[PDB]
UniProtKB/TrEMBL annotation, chain A:
Protein name as it appears in the record: Uncharacterized protein
Disulfide links within the chain: C414-C456
The species this protein was found in: Nitrosopumilus maritimus (strain SCM1)
Top-level lineage group: Archaea
Full-sequence portion shown in this chain: 507 to 1012 of 1734
Length: 506, 243, 361
């Protein structure tokens, strides 16, 4: 576990009931859709129940228990498997939990610099064909549940999370509408009660015990993200270790973590890419984790003396100070120049080679630099910039866009001025320069390109697109520099490092 | 041999005959058969508990915290209740006992029926002692002054702070120096002042000049006989600033 | 028998932003608890972009009690309800910030350590083992600038209070169990005392015991210095700031805005940050973007500055006088951060190696 996930026990021991019946024509389960709109996600929850031929004519009620560390709702029933028996819904009351309890994990996603919400559920034990999950907000009782027709007090009772999915175990990205719905309520958070509702298809029987898992994950930073108190990562990870032999009591698993950089932090792909439940899980590290904050795995245990005593292990996850170097101290025209970056934190996958590419988008401040088109303006600089190359302390960029109309001394613009000289290496983006990891998990990145005879200077860097000069200039007698920005140094903070060399002529 | 109010007492009873079990830490004083009582004039703790150092050592120890009386101003800042007057606890270490300005303490132990052993001590206030660390200072240096008054140890398990007044010839208004305890039960206090020559005296900065004597004074609200509970003697120390 | 130990012996006095005071807008602190940037960068009244973000002290408390190490190869917690107390005392008067040991509860600060019902008071929550086999437990607690005995010195603060309880309010009653006296405010001054007491429910003798550690709040004046006096134009200079006021957290390296420093010369007068004259920020090329500590607990900040060619389209001369000015809001003189100021200066030169002209014949 890291940070504060919102597990199914966040409000104490839940309450669960199963039921047979049909969705109302106004139910979010029949009318909603997952299309990032309030029309689709936000609704109310109404149902008609027929448990009159059920045993003792009551909805199936359960005995609940919660694991100390694995956080798994185990519900004990009377096992029924008859052709008559069937259930359709499950309603959970999450104990004391309210929107105050939920809001300490789920973030706004509109008033946060970088924020993403994720929902993790496992209901494989029910043997359903389709499942639908909705979060329930109300000022009344989750149990007993009431339709809108009887209680005309609330505008909306349900928030749709998953709709008619065929996966009983999934790790999904919530839309903006879900985060917009949680913060949208005008009522104070303490009075509003929260709970889960589920819809099933093909649950024909119940065993003596069944398990349910439901969590909310959150990732991002607030403001600059420079101060440690301003970075957050809330997640829980479960290891499904495998027995080594038949009669060997040894169980084997693995862990791996991805350290966040300035590029992947902006993409929801990196956070949805981890596998939270597996024999080989992965988890996110937002900053250096050592000493008391080192990641630790906990295993609750029944000892030979009969008392339950957990066992645990931790391992630190340091960050590394990156260095960038240039292979030679002097270059000549049309010499191969090779750039290497030794930052171990940039290796995000052990199986695949890790690659970083140059940005070509005239509407973004990270143009002709190694990084991401997605970007933001922050205190330390530009968040989508990882590496760039400069002549005479000026970005080496192609003359393209709307601000390249300057002709200089003559009536020829700098872009056509370069073309007449046969130069195709107009900037770093046009050489095909990429940073390529030497091995699958080496942590060393190498790129190369060839020095051009002419280049076009940037007049003003404060405008997007950049404004280019009207006349080409020789590269001879100018210094060349490479700049690398480490999002995480040995301390977990943002610093820039560089190397320089001289272009010469004879 | 002599204590102060709100001071911490440790008791060691060496009574080998009460080592009943060789593998158990033995307790004395908690029973009608074997009572102990720690008392001052006015207040007492009865059936107090003392415990063995190790299982077969036969040495018993405990500690009590004196508390003084709630109706006083040791600070002299004009709101009373500097030292809460409380009496409670029946453990080896969690004893609280009230006290007077001039008083006596005794510990009684009935090891066998119709025999007792006693240990006694005195409780007296004390005068204050104030001095600068160095006789002469530079015009731009920093000042530290040491004050020694065991009566100002209001909490023996915590570090205590009180305000000394600091002024110079240039500015008679001066400043209020907050001195702090070096250790939780040592009763020695120290504080730090900046010397400015070209600015107003504020907080711990003191406007001074060449050959200007500086003065720090401590008002002793806790003074023993011949003085009374109401007498307020001022102890002060001086140093010259010569470059 | 347990032991308890505090993070540090001496602590900086914390400060706040302008958002905490209800006082009318001004170009100076005007007796508020703020740490403004240098005056040359301030635009009319002080606004959110012209002071350092809110400075909240973070302390760490460790209890070394092996008796809570039930699991010798597994996580544990100090589960003894309200066994740790954190309090701020000034002379006789005391203020108790909260308890630790019990499940966390919304509560208020206690005034005088006197309140009848302990359920009314803030609980920090159960502590956690630093390592599975360590037997040492740690707590992280955040101390704001409003937490201490009421005093007359802080009446200048038109303080709006952070509501510790569930409610949203800026009154002293929302954060403290007792309202402050008229003409007084709750605050921390220089020379105040921070203590933690641990009530060990089982000591070496098998009974209850109380162990304690203490520390003091203090403010110090800054020292500003450089690697060498004379610099060639376009060279890199190392700039060092010794402000112990700024080591709010020992565990992390704290970052501070570069606008605090003043650059004044014949060329231009500027703050060397985002608030300087147009194009001044790019003219210095700071690495990193602003001040950073040289370790977790040093109180020493370093920045690398390139000597500009032309600040404001005016080029620097040889031997030109350059003054670096830092305003230490919270010197030794001040009682709280705000209040008095002291200016610390550094002088540096562009090099002056004369030129010569030679001809062959």
């Amino acid at each position: 576990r890291t940070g504060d996930p919102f597990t199914i026990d966040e409000g104490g021991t839940p309450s669960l009931i199963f039921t047979n019946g049909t969705n109302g024509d106004d139910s979010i389960f029949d009318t909603g859709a997952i299309n990032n709109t309030s029309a689709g996600q936000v609704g109310n929850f109404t149902l008609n129940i027929n448990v009159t031929r059920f045993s003792s004519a009551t909805n199936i009620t359960s005995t609940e228990s919660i694991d100390t560390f694995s956080k798994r709702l185990i519900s004990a029933q009377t096992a029924n498997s008859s052709a008559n028996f069937d259930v359709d819904f499950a309603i959970i009351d999450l104990g004391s939990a309210t929107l105050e309890t939920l809001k300490e994990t789920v973030v706004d996603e509109d008033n946060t610099a970088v924020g993403f919400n994720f929902f993790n559920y496992d209901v494989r034990s029910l043997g359903a064909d389709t499942v639908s999950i909705a979060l329930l907000n109300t000022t009344g009782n989750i149990l007993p549940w009431v339709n809108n027709d009887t209680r005309n007090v609330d505008k909306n009772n349900a928030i749709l999370l998953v709709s008619n999915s065929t996966n009983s175990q999934a790790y999904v990205d919530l839309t903006n509408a879900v985060s917009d719905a949680v913060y949208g309520s005008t009522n104070t958070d303490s009075n509003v009660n929260i709970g889960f509702a589920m819809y099933f298809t093909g649950v024909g029987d119940l065993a003596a015990k069944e398990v349910i898992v439901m969590d909310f994950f959150s990732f991002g930073f607030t403001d600059d993200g420079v101060q440690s108190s301003e970075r957050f990562a809330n997640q829980i990870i479960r290891i499904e270790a495998e027995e080594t032999g038949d009669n060997t009591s040894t169980f084997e698993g693995s862990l791996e973590y991805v350290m966040v950089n300035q590029i992947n932090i902006q993409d929801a792909g990196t956070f949805s890419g981890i596998t939270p439940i597996a024999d080989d899980p992965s988890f996110i590290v937002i900053e250096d984790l050592t000493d008391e904050d080192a990641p630790r795995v906990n295993y609750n245990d029944l000892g030979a003396d009969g008392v339950t005593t957990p066992v645990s292990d931790q391992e630190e996850a340091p960050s590394h100070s990156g260095v960038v170097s240039l292979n030679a101290d002097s270059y000549k025209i049309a010499d191969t120049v090779v750039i290497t970056v030794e930052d171990l934190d940039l290796n995000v996958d052990s199986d695949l080679i890790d690659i970083f590419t140059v940005v070509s988008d005239n509407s973004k401040a990270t143009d002709d630099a190694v990084g991401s088109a997605t970007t933001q303006s922050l205190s330390f600089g530009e968040l989508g910039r990882l590496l760039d190359v400069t002549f005479d302390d000026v970005i080496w960029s192609t003359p393209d866009g709307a601000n390249n109309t300057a002709t200089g001394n003559d009536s020829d613009t700098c872009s056509t001025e370069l073309s007449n000289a046969g130069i195709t290496d107009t900037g770093l983006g046009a050489t095909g320069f990429t940073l390529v990891e030497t091995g699958a998990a080496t942590g060393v990145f190498v790129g190369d390109f060839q020095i051009p005879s002419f280049w076009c200077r940037v007049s003003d860097t404060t405008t997007t697109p950049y404004t280019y000069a009207g006349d080409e200039e020789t590269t001879t007698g100018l210094d060349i520099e490479v700049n690398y920005v480490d999002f995480r140094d040995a301390s977990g903070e943002i610093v820039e490092v560089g190397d320089s060399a001289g272009v010469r002529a004879n | 041999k002599v204590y102060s109010w709100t001071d911490k007492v440790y008791i060691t009873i060496v009574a080998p005959d009460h080592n009943f079990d060789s593998d158990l830490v033995d307790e004395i004083g908690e029973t009608d058969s074997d009572p102990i009582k720690v008392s001052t004039r006015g207040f007492d703790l009865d059936n107090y508990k003392l415990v063995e150092t190790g299982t077969d050592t036969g040495i018993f120890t405990g500690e009590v915290i004196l508390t003084g009386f709630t109706a006083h101003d040791a600070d002299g800042d004009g709101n009373t209740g500097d030292a809460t007057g409380t009496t409670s606890g029946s453990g080896p270490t969690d004893g609280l006992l009230a006290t007077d300005d001039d008083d006596g303490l005794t510990v009684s132990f009935e090891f066998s029926e119709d025999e007792t052993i006693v240990g006694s001590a005195l409780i007296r206030w004390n005068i204050g002692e104030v001095q600068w660390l160095e006789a002469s200072y530079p015009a731009s240096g920093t000042g530290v002054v040491r004050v020694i008054d065991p009566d100002m140890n209001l909490d023996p398990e915590a570090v205590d702070n009180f305000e000394v007044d600091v002024w110079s010839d240039s500015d008679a208004g001066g400043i209020d120096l907050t001195v702090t305890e070096t250790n939780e039960a040592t009763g020695i206090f120290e504080g730090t002042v900046f010397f400015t020559t070209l600015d107003e005296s504020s907080g711990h900065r003191l406007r001074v000049s060449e050959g200007d004597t500086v003065t720090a004074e401590y008002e002793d609200n806790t003074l023993p006989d011949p003085y009374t509970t109401a007498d307020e003697l001022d102890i002060t120390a001086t140093s010259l600033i010569g470059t | 028998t347990g032991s308890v130990s505090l993070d540090r012996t001496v602590y900086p006095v914390p400060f706040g932003t302008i958002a905490d005071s209800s006082k009318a807008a001004n170009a100076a602190p005007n007796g508020r608890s703020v740490f403004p940037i240098h005056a040359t960068g301030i635009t009319s009244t002080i606004d959110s972009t012209e002071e350092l973000p809110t400075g909240d002290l973070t302390i760490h408390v460790r209890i070394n009690d092996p008796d809570f190490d039930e699991n010798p190869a597994g996580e544990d917690a100090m589960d003894q309800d309200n066994a740790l107390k954190i309090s701020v005392i000034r002379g006789s008067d005391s203020v108790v910030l909260g308890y630790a040991g019990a499940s966390e509860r919304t509560g208020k600060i206690d005034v005088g350590g006197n309140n009848g019902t302990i359920s009314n008071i803030r609980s920090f929550g159960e502590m956690d083992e630093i390592a599975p086999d360590a037997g040492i437990f740690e707590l992280d607690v955040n101390i704001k600038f409003t937490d201490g005995p009421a005093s007359a010195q802080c009446n200048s603060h038109d303080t709006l209070y952070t509501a510790l309880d569930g409610t949203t309010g800026k009154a002293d009653t929302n954060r403290f169990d007792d309202g402050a006296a008229s003409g007084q405010e709750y605050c921390i001054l220089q020379g105040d005392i921070l203590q933690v007491e641990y009530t060990d429910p089982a000591d070496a003798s098998g009974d209850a015991n109380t162990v304690t550690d203490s520390a003091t709040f203090d403010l110090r004046n800054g020292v500003l210095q450089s690697d060498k006096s004379v610099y060639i134009i376009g060279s890199d200079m190392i700039l060092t700031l010794i402000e112990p006021d700024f080591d709010l957290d020992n565990d992390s390296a704290e970052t501070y805005d570069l606008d605090l420093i003043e650059w004044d010369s014949d060329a231009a007068t500027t703050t060397m940050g985002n608030k300087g004259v147009t194009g001044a920020a790019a003219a210095f090329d700071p690495e990193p973007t602003d001040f950073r500590e040289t370790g977790d607990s040093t109180g020493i900040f370093q920045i690398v500055i390139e000597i500009p060619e032309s600040l404001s389209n005016d080029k620097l001369e040889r031997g030109e006088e350059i003054i670096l000015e830092y305003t230490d809001w919270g010197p030794s003189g001040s009682d709280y951060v705000g209040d008095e100021d002291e200016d610390v200066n550094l002088t540096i030169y562009t090099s002056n190696f004369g030129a010569t002209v030679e001809l062959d014949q």
